A paper describes a structure:
We further focus-refined the stably associated Delta RBD-1-ACE2 region to 3.4-Å-resolution, which clearly depicts the side-chain densities of the mutated RBM L452R and T478K. Specifically, the substituted K478 forms a new hydrogen bond (H-bond) with the main chain of N487 (also resides in loop), potentially stabilizing the key RBM loop. Of note, this substitution also results in the formation of two new H-bonds with ACE2 (including Y489 with ACE2 Y83, and F490 with ACE2 K31), enhancing the S-ACE2 interaction. Further inspection of the surface property showed that the T478K substitution makes the substituted site more positively charged and hydrophilic, which may strengthen RBM interaction with the negatively charged and hydrophilic ACE2 in the interaction interface. Corroborating this, the Delta variant RBD-ACE2 interaction area (928.4 Å2) was enlarged compared to that of the WT (843.3 Å2). Collectively, this Delta variant RBM T478K substitution could stabilize and induce conformational change of the RBM loop and strengthen the interaction with ACE2 receptor, potentially leading to enhanced transmissibility of the Delta variant. Another mutation in the Delta variant RBD, L452R, is not involved in the interaction with ACE2, however, this mutation results in a hydrophilic, basic local surface property reverse, and an elongated side chain, which may affect the binding of MAbs targeting this region, potentially leading to immune evasion. Noteworthy, our Delta RBD-1-ACE2 structure showed that the T478K substitution in Delta can stabilize and reshape the RBM loop by forming a new H-bond with N487 also within this loop, which induces the formation of two additional H-bonds between loop and ACE2, thus enhancing the binding affinity of Delta S with ACE2.
Numbering used by the authors:
A (entry chain E): 333 to 526
B (entry chain A): 19 to 615
The structure:
């Protein structure tokens, strides 16, 4: 019997940005969550709905693993019932969330001298996000009634602003890689338990 | 679909783009201050010009949102600091003449050398050259040569440049809907939009000259004691009835009187308080000064320093392989990175400075949650006041005995508390008329209150009336004496050194009455008391988002700028100074002159 490929979600060499967060449908494998508490390298391990003790006694149908890179003080926005520039425009968790959230510092892989401008985020979106909705869009945010035919000018801003990741930044500005496991029970058979 | 909706939307584009350019303009400016090198001087000028040009494209975009239609007072504070054109209202000739003058006015001040053309031994640099001869010399002509011949070239090649600097910066402020340029420097203390807390730009003149009518009975006794003690050093030069000569106050202009303490001690047979012989014998280094300065701010409730504070900041002079301008500046680079740059040594003057330049960082760490245009002090003399109340608390013998520095059986008497206050009165009270008179001079040269012929006659008419200082030999109109100072040539505001004094005792009387002290104010201390540092942190975290009259009411309870704490600090000295001045002449006469023959 096989193990779950958690070595592709947590130890990936290049993560994604929070506007275009990845998602991996993990199913039909013997998931070992007991080595995740004892790793002692995750800065934040918050489990909503489930317990860290009940995670090896219960079996789930689908375990979705959403991975992205955010700032230091925006890890608190990845929580059921938060608001900000990430929990409303980039990655919104539903209010009845039933999963666990991983978060750990990655300053020595995601920050180069001079700036690592590969990670971006939605700064301006014309509405709010539904829970677990991802929309990659490069549309110029019409903040008025002019209108603007693509030309980024007066009160028509580009929504994807980049992250200024540098190795000399503070704790609250250093890149925290975040993996969000979202367990669920559906009307299919379930075989993901340790 | 409303202007206040598009204003917050525009500032979210600003705060998430200016923060990525202010860091690269400060990290590149940090690399020049640590490495004085021909390569790193351009990286602070290429990346420093990317932010200097960024604030010009946003100041042309932010003026499309009128400030009459926005009702949120937080947005109107960020847009008022962004819609100001500055020097963009001038033409191409006048803006080029201004930057040519400012790059040349700071050049003749810094690179002005003093030599005697008749003697080969009389040549020296500025620091530690010309600053040494004007401080620790006991002669009259040795100080007069370093004072007249310093303004014989720097005070003469800065007169026609500063004459054109008056008419250039007046058109910079008359087109910005201010009255003069003197009314542009009082625009930092301006508060509009709040009912009951309206502070006008013209009420700063009404407040500064009202605070001087109470500090003048204290200064007249400090001046009459310093003059009476200078009779024993120069018995054939100073009259004990008139005023003081200019070059005997301690340094090149006479701003601080700190170097006059070594000759005018109150009691010379008493042991002076010092930890310099208690830091080398205990083997203190550059880390232990800041490890013991960090425990002062943790004990009042302010948080610890960052981990990036200890690996990136420069504390020790890094050998001879690289030269670093290590004047003590506390660096707030933005994006949560807080550093500090100073050449530390094992002395008390660098132990109190480490408390002074970490109190700036505990202020910059407090308003980090604010937006980018509100990350500053409540006014200009508000940042330097919260940094120096820590220097007034880390020098008392209650703190120097708490960290094992001072002796456990060091006696404190009546004659010890005076000798500490006269070291403080020459640095704090003695610089108060010198700070007010120069800003009385700049606000009267920008208002057009003087013509050209009394340009240098009405400057020494104010030194012989406010600070009580005569000239040794008269200067004609070809001279220009105030431009020799650093803040006049490099065009800095100077009233921020007058209001930081009146605020640092309003704060300390507010932080000692919160810490429940029973006794005089100069023996007080705020450490080991969380209920006093949490009083200050509710003001430190505000930043510029609140007006400075409401930030004073958060800690003191008075919206005004008051004197009475500063007279309550020096009250054990002012009681003694009256009793030492029964036989002297309290007050001065303008008619005396050393060349009145």
């Amino acid at each position: 019997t096989n193990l779950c490929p958690f070595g592709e979600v947590f130890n990936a060499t290049r993560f994604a940005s929070v506007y275009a967060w990845n998602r991996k449908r993990i199913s039909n494998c013997v998931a070992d969550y007991s080595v995740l508490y004892n790793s002692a390298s995750f800065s934040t391990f918050k489990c909503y709905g489930v317990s860290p003790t009940k995670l090896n006694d219960l079996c789930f149908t689908n375990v979705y693993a959403d991975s992205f890179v955010i700032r230091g003080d925006e890890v608190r926005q990845i929580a059921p019932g938060q608001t900000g520039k990430i929990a409303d425009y980039n990655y919104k968790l539903p209010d009845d969330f039933t999963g666990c959230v991983i978060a750990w510092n990655s300053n020595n892989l995601d920050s180069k001298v001079g700036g690592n401008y590969n990670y971006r985020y939605r700064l301006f979106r014309k509405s709010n996000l539904k829970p677990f909705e991802r929309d990659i869009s490069t549309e110029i945010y019409q903040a008025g009634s002019k209108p603007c035919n693509g030309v980024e000018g007066f009160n028509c801003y580009f929504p994807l602003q980049s992250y200024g990741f540098q190795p000399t930044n503070g704790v609250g500005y250093q890149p925290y890689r975040v993996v969000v496991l979202s367990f669920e029970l559906l009307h299919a058979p379930a075989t993901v338990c340790g | 679909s409303t202007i206040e909706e598009q204003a917050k939307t525009f500032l979210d584009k600003f705060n998430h783009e200016a923060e990525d350019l202010f860091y690269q303009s400060s990290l590149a400016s940090w690399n020049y201050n640590t490495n004085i090198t021909e390569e790193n001087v351009q990286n602070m000028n290429n990346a420093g010009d990317k932010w200097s040009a960024f604030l010009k494209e946003q100041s042309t975009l932010a003026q499309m949102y009128p400030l009459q239609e926005i009702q949120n007072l937080t947005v109107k504070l960020q847009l008022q600091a962004l819609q100001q054109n500055g020097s963009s209202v001038l033409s191409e000739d006048k803006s080029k003449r201004l930057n040519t003058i400012l790059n040349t006015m700071s050049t003749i001040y810094s690179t002005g050398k003093v030599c005697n053309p008749d003697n080969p031994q009389e040549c020296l640099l500025l620091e530690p050259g010309l600053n040494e001869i004007m401080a620790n010399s006991l002669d009259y002509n040795e100080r007069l040569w370093a004072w007249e011949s310093w303004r014989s070239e720097v005070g003469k090649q800065l007169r026609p440049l500063y004459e054109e600097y008056v008419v250039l910066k007046n058109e910079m402020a008359r087109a910005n809907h201010y009255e003069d340029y003197g009314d542009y420097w009082r625009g930092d203390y301006e508060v509009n939009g709040v009912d009951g807390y309206d502070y006008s730009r013209g009420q700063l003149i009404e407040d500064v000259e009202h605070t001087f009518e109470e500090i003048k009975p204290l200064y007249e006794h400090l001046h009459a004691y310093v003059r009476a003690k200078l009779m024993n050093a120069y018995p054939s030069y100073i009259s004990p009835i008139g005023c003081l000569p200019a070059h005997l106050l301690g340094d090149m202009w006479g701003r601080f009187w700190t170097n006059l303490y070594s000759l005018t001690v109150p009691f010379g047979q008493k042991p002076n308080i010092d930890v310099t012989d208690a830091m080398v014998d205990q083997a203190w280094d550059a880390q232990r000064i800041f490890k013991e300065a960090e425990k002062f701010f943790v004990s009042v409730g302010l948080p610890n320093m960052t981990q990036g504070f200890w690996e990136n900041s420069m504390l020790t002079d890094p050998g001879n392989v690289q030269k670093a301008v290590c004047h003590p500046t506390a660096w707030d680079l933005g994006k949560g990175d807080f550093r500090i740059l100073m050449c530390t040594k094992v002395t008390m003057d660098d132990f109190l400075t480490a408390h002074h330049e970490m109190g700036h960082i505990q202020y910059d760490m407090a308003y980090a949650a604010q937006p980018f245009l509100l990350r500053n002090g409540a006014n200009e003399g508000f940042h330097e006041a919260v940094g120096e109340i820590m220097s007034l608390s880390a020098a008392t013998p209650k703190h120097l005995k708490s960290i094992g520095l001072l002796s456990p059986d060091f006696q404190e008497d009546n004659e010890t508390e005076i000798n500490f206050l006269l070291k403080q009165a020459l640095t704090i009270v003695g610089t108060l008329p010198f700070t007010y008179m120069l800003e009385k001079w700049r606000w009267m040269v920008f208002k057009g209150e003087i013509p050209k012929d009394q340009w240098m006659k009405k400057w020494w008419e104010m030194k012989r009336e406010i600070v009580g200082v005569v000239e040794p030999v008269p200067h004609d109109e070809t001279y220009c004496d105030p431009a020799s100072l650093f803040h006049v040539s490099n065009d800095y505001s100077f009233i921020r050194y007058y209001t930081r004094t009146l605020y640092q005792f309003q704060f300390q009387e507010a932080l000692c009455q919160a810490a429940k002290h029973e006794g005089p104010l100069h023996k007080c201390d705020i450490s080991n008391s969380t209920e006093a540092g949490q009083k200050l942190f509710n003001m430190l975290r505000l930043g510029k988002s609140e007006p400075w009259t409401l930030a004073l009411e958060n800690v003191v309870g008075a919206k005004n700028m008051n004197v009475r704490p500063l007279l309550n600090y020096f009250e054990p000295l002012f009681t003694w100074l009256k009793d030492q001045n029964k036989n002297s002449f309290v007050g001065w006469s303008t008619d005396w002159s050393p060349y009145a023959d």
